[PDB]
Amino acid sequence: TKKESFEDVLPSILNTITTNSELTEVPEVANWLKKVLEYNLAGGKKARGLTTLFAYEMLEKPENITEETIYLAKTLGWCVEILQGFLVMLDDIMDGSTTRRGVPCWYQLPEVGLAAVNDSSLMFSSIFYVLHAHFADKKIYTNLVELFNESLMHTSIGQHLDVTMERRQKSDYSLFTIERYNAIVKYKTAYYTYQLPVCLGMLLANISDPVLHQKAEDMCLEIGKFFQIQDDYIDCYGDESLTGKMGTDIQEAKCSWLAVMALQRCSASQKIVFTTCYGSKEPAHIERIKELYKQLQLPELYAQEETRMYESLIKQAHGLPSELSPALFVRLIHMIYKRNH
Amino acid sequence: KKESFEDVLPSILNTITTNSELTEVPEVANWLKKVLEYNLAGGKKARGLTTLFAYEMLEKPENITEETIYLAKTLGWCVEILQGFLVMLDDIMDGSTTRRGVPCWYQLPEVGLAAVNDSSLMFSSIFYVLHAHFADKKIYTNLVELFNESLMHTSIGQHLDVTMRQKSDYSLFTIERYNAIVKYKTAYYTYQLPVCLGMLLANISDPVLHQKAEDMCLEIGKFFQIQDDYIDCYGDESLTGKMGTDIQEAKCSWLAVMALQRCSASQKIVFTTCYGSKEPAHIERIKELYKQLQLPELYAQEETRMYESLIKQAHGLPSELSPALFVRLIHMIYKRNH
Ligand SMILES: C[n+]1ccccc1CC(P(=O)(O)O)P(=O)(O)O
Ligand SMILES: C[n+]1ccccc1CC(P(=O)(O)O)P(=O)(O)O
Ligand SMILES: [Mg+2]
Ligand SMILES: [Mg+2]
Ligand SMILES: [Mg+2]
Ligand SMILES: [Mg+2]
Ligand SMILES: [Mg+2]
Ligand SMILES: [Mg+2]
Q: Distance (Å) from the C-alpha of residue B80 to the closest C-alpha of chain A? A: 18
Ligand 8 centroid vs A216 CA: distance in angstroms? 48
Q: Under a CB-based contact definition with an 8 Å cutoff, are residues B255 and B290 in contact?
A: yes
Cβ count near A244 (within 10 Å): 15
The amino acid sitting at B113 is: L
A147: closest CA among B119, B197, B21, B152? B21
Distance CA A168, CA A187 (A): 19
- Residue A122 to residue B155, Cβ atoms within 8 A: yes
Distance CA A259, CA A265 (A): 10
- List, in sequence order, every beta strand (DSSP E) within chain B: 98-99, 102-103
Distance in angstroms between the alpha carbons of the first and the last residue of chain A: 20
Residues of A designated as active site: 45, 86, 91, 95, 100, 162, 188, 227, 231-232
- Residue A118 to residue B89, Cβ atoms within 8 A: yes
Q: Under a CB-based contact definition with an 8 Å cutoff, are residues A277 and A285 in contact?
A: yes
Cα within 13 Å of Cα(B300), Cβ side = 4
Q: Which CATH code for domain B1-338? A: 1.10.600.10
User: Which of A114, A131, A177 is the best residue to mutate to test the B interface, defined by the most B CB atoms within 10 Å of its own CB?
Assistant: A114
Q: Under a CB-based contact definition with an 8 Å cutoff, are residues B336 and B299 in contact?
A: no
Q: Under a CB-based contact definition with an 8 Å cutoff, are residues A75 and A13 in contact?
A: yes
Q: Under a CB-based contact definition with an 8 Å cutoff, are residues A258 and A232 in contact?
A: yes
Question: Measured at the alpha carbon of residue A332, what is the angle toward residues A328 and A338, in degrees to the nearest 5?
Answer: 150
Tell which phi-psi region holds residue A169, choosing left (phi > 0), alpha (psi between -120 and 50) or beta. beta
Output the CA torsion sign for A141, A144, A148, A149.
Answer: positive
Q: Which CATH superfamily is domain A1-341 in?
A: Farnesyl Diphosphate Synthase (1.10.600.10)
B227: closest CA among B303, B331, B312? B303
Q: Tell me the backbone φ, ψ of residue B167, rounded to 5 degrees.
A: 65, -110
CA dihedral A49, A53, A54, A60 (to 10 degrees): 150
Question: What is the three-class DSSP state of A104?
Answer: strand
Query: Residue A317, exposed/middle/buried by CB under 10 A (0-12, 13-18, 19+)?
Result: buried
B186: closest CA among B212, B231, B223? B223
Range A174-179 contact pairs with CB under 8 angstroms and sequence separation of 24 or more: A175/A255, A176/A255, A176/A259, A176/A260, A176/A263, A177/A260, A178/A260
Cβ count near B38 (within 10 Å): 16
Q: Which chain A residue's Cα is nearest to B28?
A: A157
Pocket test for ligand 2, best of B39, B86, B90, B251 (most atoms within 8 A of CB): B90
Q: Distance (Å) from the C-alpha of residue B264 to the closest C-alpha of chain A? A: 31
Q: Under a CB-based contact definition with an 8 Å cutoff, are residues B147 and B127 in contact?
A: yes
- Residue A160 to residue B89, Cβ atoms within 8 A: no
Distance in angstroms between the alpha carbons of the first and the last residue of chain B: 19
Question: What is the three-class DSSP state of A143?
Answer: helix
Q: Describe the crossing of helices B254-262 and B265-274 by its angle, rounded to 10 degrees.
A: 150
